[PDB]
């Protein structure tokens, strides 16, 4: 006979920690790194040069 | 538990015995209970009386 850790057990908690636990990252690039156009509407004309003489 | 022992060097006897104590678990689990009392705005508003109070 000898009160091993399974007749203790009820006695034994297990502990938590925090040093692996992140949440997600913003990795997105494209709006920090191209020039923004605030739209005012679904679609916007964009008129550009093709040919000269 | 205790016992009562002798004092023999080599009889089985003069041995004073091994024992264990021992613990177990008892628990409390949350559950839930609910209802939903759905009413018609009408008959809300043609009663005498505050239904949604009621």
């Known amino acids: 006979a000898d009160t091993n850790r399974t007749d203790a057990a009820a006695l034994i908690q297990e502990a938590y920690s925090d040093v692996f636990l992140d949440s997600v990252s913003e990795t997105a690039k494209v709006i920090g790194t191209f020039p923004v156009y605030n739209m005012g509407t679904k679609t916007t004309n964009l008129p550009v040069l093709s040919t000269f003489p | ?54």
């Open chain 2, 1 to 54: 538990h205790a016992k009562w022992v002798g004092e023999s060097a080599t009889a089985p006897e003069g041995v004073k015995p091994t024992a264990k104590a021992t613990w177990a678990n008892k628990t409390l689990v949350a559950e839930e209970l609910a209802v939903i009392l759905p009413i018609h705005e009408n008959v809300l508003a043609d009663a005498t009386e505050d239904l949604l109070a009621e």
